Symmetry: C3
Subunit: 141 residues, 3 copies
Amino acid sequence: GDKPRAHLTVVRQTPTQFPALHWEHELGLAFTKNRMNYTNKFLLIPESGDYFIYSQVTFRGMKPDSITVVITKVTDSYPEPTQLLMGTKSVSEVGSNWFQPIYLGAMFSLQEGDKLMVNVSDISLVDYTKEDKTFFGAFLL
Amino acid sequence: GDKPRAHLTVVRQTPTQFPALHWEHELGLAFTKNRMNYTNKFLLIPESGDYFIYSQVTFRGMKPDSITVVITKVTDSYPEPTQLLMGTKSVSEVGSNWFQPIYLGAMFSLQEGDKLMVNVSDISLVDYTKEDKTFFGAFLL
Amino acid sequence: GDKPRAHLTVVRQTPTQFPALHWEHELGLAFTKNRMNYTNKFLLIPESGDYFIYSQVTFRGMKPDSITVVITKVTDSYPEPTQLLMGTKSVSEVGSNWFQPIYLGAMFSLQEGDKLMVNVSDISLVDYTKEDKTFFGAFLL
């Protein structure tokens, strides 16, 4: 019942290394509950356990040779972040107004206090227009 | 144990706006159980709760500039459907006998009585040949 | 709590029909637990129930007309394997050092003793370099 759960949705990114995305966490379809805390661009894990994690980033053109989404874990004890999931695609067509999604999801054993973020190769290529096209979520199984 | 669950699989579409797909719900790998009801092209949600939803649509050529899958919620109180998930891809190669899947899945808070459907940009491009290539499912977490 | 769960990660494939992949099951992010048994290239299902299954295979070039991932079930009673999930994509660009992921995941009713494997169209195109790019997992819901 009360398992930690969040579904986060894209917003226009404020200008700022694969940079980390920041998210909507309460409006429209986005939510956090049962001690899941969306804070400082991280999803903060409240309970040690196995979680299913997921993200889609829709990229659209307007130059890149490829586009990448990486979902990363930062742990308090470890200096280095751990890459959990990576979706990387070479981009074929020139121009353009191409567009395409990269979707990733898998199960990972996480510790209370772990922080999850989504990093992208190029923030300016991320389609931020709609909550249904770019999103990031996690739930305790 | 007895959580609402369905996995639905593609069938040849009967001719008929992003049109909605209709599905196999009992033969081969397809099923509905624990009060999940596949009715009138909708998955009907029997219990309020958080659900993981998912679909893949394999598109194949034989003209389009892009292909789109949208998973949509219709609620009794709301006039307008809500787009939960969208996978949209520009199509690069001309001709052709190209083919490619769009996969989407995420967690949403749903109300008893909600109805879920999958809409596509072009029904004629949907590969309906095999239950393992185009599918649509949901489970209460 | 103690539901069968595994997340398996890619390794360099030892040379050997869509051939089956073999996996890391204990180092880095990979694990098996609660009676899930990774044995002889199969995930062996210890308990009858509904499982969410998933895989991504990142393919990279260095000739193919297409790339395919299939997740397959072998049952003791049945002679023939059952294809549960298939992601197949035509490959457009010539050369090359193209790369791209195919991700698939869905829910299936499995019997104790069932064995799950991931088959690919071309083992030599599978990117085996990183545990976050090619992976295969399953959990009892």
